[PDB]
Amino acid sequence: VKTIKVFTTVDNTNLHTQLVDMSMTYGQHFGPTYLDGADVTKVKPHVNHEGKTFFVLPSDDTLRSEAFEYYHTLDESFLGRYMSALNHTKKWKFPQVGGLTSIKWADNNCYLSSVLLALQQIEVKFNAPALQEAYYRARAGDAANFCALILAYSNKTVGELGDVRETMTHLLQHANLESAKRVLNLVCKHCGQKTTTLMGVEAVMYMGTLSYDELKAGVSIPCVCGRDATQYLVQQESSFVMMSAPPAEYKLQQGTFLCANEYTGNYQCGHYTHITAKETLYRIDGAHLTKMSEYKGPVTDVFYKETSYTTTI
Amino acid sequence: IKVFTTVDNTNLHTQLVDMSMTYGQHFGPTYLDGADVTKVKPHVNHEGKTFFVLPSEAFEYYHTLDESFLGRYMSALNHTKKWKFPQVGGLTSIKWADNNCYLSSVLLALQQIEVKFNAPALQEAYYRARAGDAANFCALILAYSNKTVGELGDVRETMTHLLQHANLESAKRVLNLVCKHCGQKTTTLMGVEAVMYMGTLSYDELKAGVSIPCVCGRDATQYLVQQESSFVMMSAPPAEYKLQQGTFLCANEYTGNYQCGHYTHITAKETLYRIDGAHLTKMSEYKGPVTDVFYKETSYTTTI
Numbered sequence: 371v372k373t374i375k376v377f378t379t380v381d382n383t384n385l386h387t388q389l390v391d392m393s394m395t396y397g398q399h400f401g402p403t404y405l406d407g408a409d410v411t412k413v414k415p416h417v418n419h420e421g422k423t424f425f426v427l428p429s430d431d432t433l434r435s436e437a438f439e440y441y442h443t444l445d446e447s448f449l450g451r452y453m454s455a456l457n458h459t460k461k462w463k464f465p466q467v468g469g470l471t472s473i474k475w476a477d478n479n480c481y482l483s484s485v486l487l488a489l490q491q492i493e494v495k496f497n498a499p500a501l502q503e504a505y506y507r508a509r510a511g512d513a514a515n516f517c518a519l520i521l522a523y524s525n526k527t528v529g530e531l532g533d534v535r536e537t538m539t540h541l542l543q544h545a546n547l548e549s550a551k552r553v554l555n556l557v558c559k560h561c562g563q564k565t566t567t568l569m570g571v572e573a574v575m576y577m578g579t580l581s582y583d584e585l586k587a588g589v590s591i592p593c594v595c596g597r598d599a600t601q602y603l604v605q606q607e608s609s610f611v612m613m614s615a616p617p618a619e620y621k622l623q624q625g626t627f628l629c630a631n632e633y634t635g636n637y638q639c640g641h642y643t644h645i646t647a648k649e650t651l652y653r654i655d656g657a658h659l660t661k662m663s664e665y666k667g668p669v670t671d672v673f674y675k676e677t678s679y680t681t682t683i
Numbered sequence: 684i685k686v687f688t689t690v691d692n693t694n695l696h697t698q699l700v701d702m703s704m705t706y707g708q709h710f711g712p713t714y715l716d717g718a719d720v721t722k723v724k725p726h727v728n729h730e731g732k733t734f735f736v737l738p739s740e741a742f743e744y745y746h747t748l749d750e751s752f753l754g755r756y757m758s759a760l761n762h763t764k765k766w767k768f769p770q771v772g773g774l775t776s777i778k779w780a781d782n783n784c785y786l787s788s789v790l791l792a793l794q795q796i797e798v799k800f801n802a803p804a805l806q807e808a809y810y811r812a813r814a815g816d817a818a819n820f821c822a823l824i825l826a827y828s829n830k831t832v833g834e835l836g837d838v839r840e841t842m843t844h845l846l847q848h849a850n851l852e853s854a855k856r857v858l859n860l861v862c863k864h865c866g867q868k869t870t871t872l873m874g875v876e877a878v879m880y881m882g883t884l885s886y887d888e889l890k891a892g893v894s895i896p897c898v899c900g901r902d903a904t905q906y907l908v909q910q911e912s913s914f915v916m917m918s919a920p921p922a923e924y925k926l927q928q929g930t931f932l933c934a935n936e937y938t939g940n941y942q943c944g945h946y947t948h949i950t951a952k953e954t955l956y957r958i959d960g961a962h963l964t965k966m967s968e969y970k971g972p973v974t975d976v977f978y979k980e981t982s983y984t985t986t987i
């Protein structure tokens with residue numbers, strides 16, 4: 371009979387040596403099973419699953435009960451996906467680089483580091499108590515729990531490359547952005563001018579341009595009627611803004627921005643490095659730290675600090 | 684959910700799959716990133732990935748009786764085409780992507796050892812890997828090792844599956860085991876076993892004598908008697924170890940926990956080089972955690 375040697379844990383520290391019978395579901399061996407942040411309760415054991423550690427979560431366990439108030443989520447697989455990915459993120463190294471907490475390269479965490487580095491510089495707060503606890507500990511150097519939560523809130527698996535803008539979007543859904551306000555005036559000369567209002571994550575993020583000043587002057591976006599119109603920023607009541615765009619050559623001048631992220635490589639297979647401005651421009655590539663006065667490379671996301679804004683027009 | 688599948692590994696075909704039927708029922712034999720995902724049902728985290736589809740003529744070029752080899756090779760090829768292979772220090776390396784920390788160290792080590800592959804497909808890709816086109820060679824390694832793109836692998840383990848297809852017929856290792864109370868017997872290894880060794884990083888310790896428990900227990904001493912190979916590979920767990928220039932050929936270090944770390948390649952020529960994929964740094968001395976050390980050799984005879 372087909373067999374395999376897999377370890378299963380309920381504490382992420384103590385392993386249980388187990389033998390499973392292939393052709394039979396993982397859910398039939400020990401119930402709800404999770405591996406590297408993936409709900410693997412209905413998958414049959416594959417050959418490439420040997421020697422790996424699986425997490426088991428009883429449905430009767432009280433940890434599933436008090437899951438909402440602590441994590442602010444309704445997904446039943448959240449606890450298992452978070453605990454299984456936590457077993458792998460405990461193996462990562464979190465070196466302090468340039469005063470900020472980073473991550474050593476492992477399992478394509480090129481994007482997870484860039485997200486963690488950006489959050490340390492923006493004045494942001496999370497409504498979920500688990501995030502605020504892990505976010506604090508992530509700043510002290512112990513960021514294993516924070517990275518596992520990010521993979522759970524983003525429905526990702528350890529080893530899979532993720533997008534920074536997409537991962538920040540799922541994450542900021544649990545952040546305190548109630549007082550965030552963005553007022554945009556769209557001017558279609560065949561439909562007059564109308565004013566839209568975004569609140570929350572939509573008031574902070576934008577996709578299309580990297581320049582905050584370009585948003586203030588005017589960008590092109592399709593109107594509802596079906597033709598190109600121009601829109602510019604009118605009011606901004608947030609602690610920061612995140613500008614996004616595809617990778618392209620872009621000059622980064624000191625003092626004009628807060629931090630940024632670069633992406634070198636093809637679509638869905640590349641490498642993120644973080645750019646931050648302090649006394650000089652820093653380029654944090656996980657554990658490596660290089661300084662330069664001016665950086666010109668393919669950047670995708672640029673952060674700007676803000677308290678309040680009103681147009682001059 | 685939305686799934687991409689290709690039949691030529693170049694042109695994608697947007698396709699729709701159901702949540703209740705195995706991938707083998709949708710397009711037949713299906714493979715993803717070097718993994719046979721034919722009898723597997725579609726999972727939630729499988730959106731946006733490209734799957735390869737298959738139905739022969741594998742043994743003559745690939746030296747395998749495995750049916751799933753071509754699919755695993757073609758699916759891993761779809762992902763290895765996105766990687767960059769920059770020539771670093773005259774050798775072809777790979778920039779970090781999907782935990783290929785170990786694949787680069789293997790490719791860098793093969794360029795310095797005088798080895799040749801019996802399989803025609805390997806020799807085709809190995810030559811192109813030195814010319815700069817190493818996308819096909821990386822896909823074959825994951826197939827010969829039954830690995831998946833993105834998952835971290837061991838260099839010593841993947842080299843074992845790889846060297847099984849190399850010309851090691853004339854490889855010979857003769858070891859004399861000396862148990863002080865049971866006499867002495869001499870074993871002879873040939874092939875991959877004649878090249879690799881686990882336990883110490885120092886070749887001089889193998890020639891002088893290393894400790895290994897005898898079958899009846901206790902501890903016995905073993906030393907090298909005859910070695911008829913083009914190179915030897917010494918391996919050991921990560922530990923601090925001094926690397927002197929000229930005493931070795933190349934080595935590989937490993938920083939991090941078990942099964943979650945980072946491989947960097949070390950090569951010795953005019954000065955010590957530390958190749959971290961695309962990064963090139965030079966230094967005089969090195970003190971760090973090394974796991975695999977190479978030594979070049981053609982023949983040896985003990986003085987005792």
Ligand SMILES: Cc1ccc(N)cc1C(=O)N[C@H](C)c1cccc2ccccc12
Pocket residue numbers: 531532533615616617633635636637638639640670
């Ligand atoms: C790394 C990654 C993982 C998952 C997904 N879904 C996307 C990406 C990704 O490529 N992101 C970068 C920023 C990107 C975004 C938009 C257009 C791009 C075109 C070319 C190259 C990069 C591009």
Ligand SMILES: Cc1ccc(N)cc1C(=O)N[C@H](C)c1cccc2ccccc12
Pocket residue numbers: 835836837838919920921937939940941942943944974
């Ligand atoms: C990266 C990796 C992936 C898959 C597998 N099966 C193993 C490894 C791995 O850890 N290899 C390194 C060199 C290693 C080898 C031997 C003992 C080690 C003890 C502690 C730390 C590292 C050790």
Ligand SMILES: [Zn+2]
Pocket residue numbers: 558560561593594595596597599
């Ligand atoms: Zn209009």
Ligand SMILES: [Zn+2]
Pocket residue numbers: 531638639640762765780781
């Ligand atoms: Zn990739």
Ligand SMILES: [Zn+2]
Pocket residue numbers: 862864865897898899900901
């Ligand atoms: Zn004995």
Ligand SMILES: [Zn+2]
Pocket residue numbers: 458461476477835942943944
């Ligand atoms: Zn890892």
